[PDB]
Amino acid sequence: QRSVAVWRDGAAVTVPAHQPVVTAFDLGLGRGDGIFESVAVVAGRTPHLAAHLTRLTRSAALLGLPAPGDQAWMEMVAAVLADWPAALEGVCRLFLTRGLGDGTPPTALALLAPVPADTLRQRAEGISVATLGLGVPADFRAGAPWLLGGAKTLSYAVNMAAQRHAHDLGADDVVFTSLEGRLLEGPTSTVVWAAGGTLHTPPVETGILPGTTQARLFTAAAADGWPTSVTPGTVDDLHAADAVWLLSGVRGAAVVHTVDGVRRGDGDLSRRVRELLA
Amino acid sequence: QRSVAVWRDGAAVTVPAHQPVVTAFDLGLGRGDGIFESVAVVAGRTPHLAAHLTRLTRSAALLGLPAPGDQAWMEMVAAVLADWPAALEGVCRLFLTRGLGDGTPPTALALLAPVPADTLRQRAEGISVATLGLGVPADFRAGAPWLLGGAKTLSYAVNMAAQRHAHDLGADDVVFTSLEGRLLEGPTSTVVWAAGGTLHTPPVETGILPGTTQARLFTAAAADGWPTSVTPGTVDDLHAADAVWLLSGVRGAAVVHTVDGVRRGDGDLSRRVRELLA
Numbered sequence: 001q002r003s004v005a006v007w008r009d010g011a012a013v014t015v016p017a018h019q020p021v022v023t024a025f026d027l028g029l030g031r032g033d034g035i036f037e038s039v040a041v042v043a044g045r046t047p048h049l050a051a052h053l054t055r056l057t058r059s060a061a062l063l064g065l066p067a068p069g070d071q072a073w074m075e076m077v078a079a080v081l082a083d084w085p086a087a088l089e090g091v092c093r094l095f096l097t098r099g100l101g102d103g104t105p106p107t108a109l110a111l112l113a114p115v116p117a118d119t120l121r122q123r124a125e126g127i128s129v130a131t132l133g134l135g136v137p138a139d140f141r142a143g144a145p146w147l148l149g150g151a152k153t154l155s156y157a158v159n160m161a162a163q164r165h166a167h168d169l170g171a172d173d174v175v176f177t178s179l180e181g182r183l184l185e186g187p188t189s190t191v192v193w194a195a196g197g198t199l200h201t202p203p204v205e206t207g208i209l210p211g212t213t214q215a216r217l218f219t220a221a222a223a224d225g226w227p228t229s230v231t232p233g234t235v236d237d238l239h240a241a242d243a244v245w246l247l248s249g250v251r252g253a254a255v256v257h258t259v260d261g262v263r264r265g266d267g268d269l270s271r272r273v274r275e276l277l278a
Numbered sequence: 279q280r281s282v283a284v285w286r287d288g289a290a291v292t293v294p295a296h297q298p299v300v301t302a303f304d305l306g307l308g309r310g311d312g313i314f315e316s317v318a319v320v321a322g323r324t325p326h327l328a329a330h331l332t333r334l335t336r337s338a339a340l341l342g343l344p345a346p347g348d349q350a351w352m353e354m355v356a357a358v359l360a361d362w363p364a365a366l367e368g369v370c371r372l373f374l375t376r377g378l379g380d381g382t383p384p385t386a387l388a389l390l391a392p393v394p395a396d397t398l399r400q401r402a403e404g405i406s407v408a409t410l411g412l413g414v415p416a417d418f419r420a421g422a423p424w425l426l427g428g429a430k431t432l433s434y435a436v437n438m439a440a441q442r443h444a445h446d447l448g449a450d451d452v453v454f455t456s457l458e459g460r461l462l463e464g465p466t467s468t469v470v471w472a473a474g475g476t477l478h479t480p481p482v483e484t485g486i487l488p489g490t491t492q493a494r495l496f497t498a499a500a501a502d503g504w505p506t507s508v509t510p511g512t513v514d515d516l517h518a519a520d521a522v523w524l525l526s527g528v529r530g531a532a533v534v535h536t537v538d539g540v541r542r543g544d545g546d547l548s549r550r551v552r553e554l555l556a
């Protein structure tokens with residue numbers, strides 16, 4: 001099952017999941033002019049909701065979208081959670097669109113659906129990843145705010161086409177690379193790798209998204225005496241690593257067992273990552 | 279006024295413009311995973327509909343979207359035109375989204391609204407343009423189909439943020455540039471410029487959109503003995519030109535009187551461009 005709530009006249013309103021909620025002129029539909037956050041629902045609860053709401057706020061600020069505020073979002077999360085089975089892991093997406101235009105109200109929605117079995121299987125069994133160039137220099141987006149580098153938008157056509165291109169090659173997912181071959185991130189994930197006793201992730205001064213699963217791992221790793229580093233790594237670094245993972249809010253930690261058709265092990269490092277994230 | 283038609287059970291169905299038509303799970307909303315075309319409505323007619331439908335077909339093919347076919351689109355255009363005032367110039371947008379997922383039907387819509395007075399004023403009086411880098415090499419997108427270079431998508435968040443960035447600077451519109459400073463195109467237009475008795479436009483092997491207003495100008499220019507060229511121009515070329523225009527289906531030909539705050543004339547070349555486009 002699926003469930004949806006719309007923000008109407010300062011209240012969360014539950015509507016049937018198959019009921020249309022956005023008109024033809026919504027700029028989130030026609031232009032992809034809006035932001036989202038994907039919130040894991042585990043045993044009927046949203047363990048990391050606050051983290052996601054801080055990122056929703058930053059995404060909304062990058063796009064100059066008026067945001068309804070935390071109270072509002074928590075009320076819409078409550079609405080869609082109301083009849084949700086504790087046994088069924090969910091993805092609760094929050095969408096904010098520019099609506100019919102700035103001046104008129106932005107459209108706020110919450111939508112909840114099961115995490116798919118194939119996403120669960122990838123968390124359990126790991127993934128193959130294709131590296132695909134984005135064409136941009138690593139330092140470019142820092143000087144080009146119009147490219148929306150640190151924002152999570154409704155404009156994911158490229159993200160989806162990258163994933164289809166990867167599926168066509170026989171891979172499960174994508175890591176983007178800069179022009180010079182620097183790691184950036186997934187269409188939908190943050191890369192992390194283990195090397196020389198350290199956990200590495202690429203810098204986001206490169207204009208990628210401050211991943212919340214990754215932040216939570218690095219904080220717990222720090223506390224457990226596992227050194228962490230922001231490292232301007234390349235695909236060479238992924239091949240040479242002791243282990244590689246894609247981190248995301250919904251899939252969680254997916255070990256990367258294949259990079260560009262090159263099979264790799266994890267040096268049995270995945271267990272401590274999973275313990276720290278738990 | 280505005281009007282909308284949805285494709286339901288092999289028929290065009292008229293619905294009130296304020297009526298929701300897309301559910302929360304439509305991938306055109308949540309992911310910007312769909313295509314569009316914007317069709318000028320002039321004196322209650324769609325003079326260039328066939329041209330736009332051929333481009334809709336190519337966009338749909340780049341995204342691997344099943345397309346309903348020309349018959350269907352012409353029926354949805356007929357539906358929204360039904361009560362439309364001949365005196366009111368319109369923009370008829372056709373949207374095709376991946377729907378709830380491939381396997382399930384794509385969502386097809388037509389939506390018709392007046393061309394705004396400020397767009398009409400720009401056609402009459404011309405525009406200021408900001409050049410903004412896209413960060414990509416001119417030759418990059420040709421080797422990177424996942425970047426969707428020659429497709430017109432529902433994923434226009436960057437396009438819109440570029441335009442807002444330009445408005446903030448005091449400009450009306452944008453021309454994108456490659457890393458090396460080559461002209462690409464507008465978020466929503468094709469650049470053309472006059473130099474040395476020739477009409478120039480940038481190559482689209484660079485992964486930009488084959489503009490239909492531009493094709494129509496170059497065809498009529500050819501027939502009238504005005505030489506045309508595909509020219510790998512830079513911003514230098516826009517400053518040095520005898521005249522510069524942005525061409526698009528809805529605004530038409532907008533003379534560019536200012537490039538990056540540098541004012542320019544058109545050498546009285548705009549009249550012959552407008553005669554040829556008429």
Ligand SMILES: Cc1ncc(COP(=O)(O)O)c(/C=N/Nc2ccccc2)c1O
Pocket residue numbers: 037038152185186187188189190209210211212213214247248249250
């Ligand atoms: C570009 C990009 N980079 C990183 C993450 C890692 O973030 P976190 O640990 O907070 O999830 C995401 C995920 N978005 N979430 C998402 C995207 C698409 C579909 C569903 C969810 C992303 O989209």
Ligand SMILES: Cc1ncc(COP(=O)(O)O)c(/C=N/Nc2ccccc2)c1O
Pocket residue numbers: 315316430463464465466467468487488489490491492525526527528
């Ligand atoms: C990237 C890009 N490049 C060129 C044109 C020139 O094409 P044509 O002469 O066929 O119009 C368009 C226009 N889209 N149309 C459009 C875009 C946004 C909003 C409304 C219409 C465009 O979006």
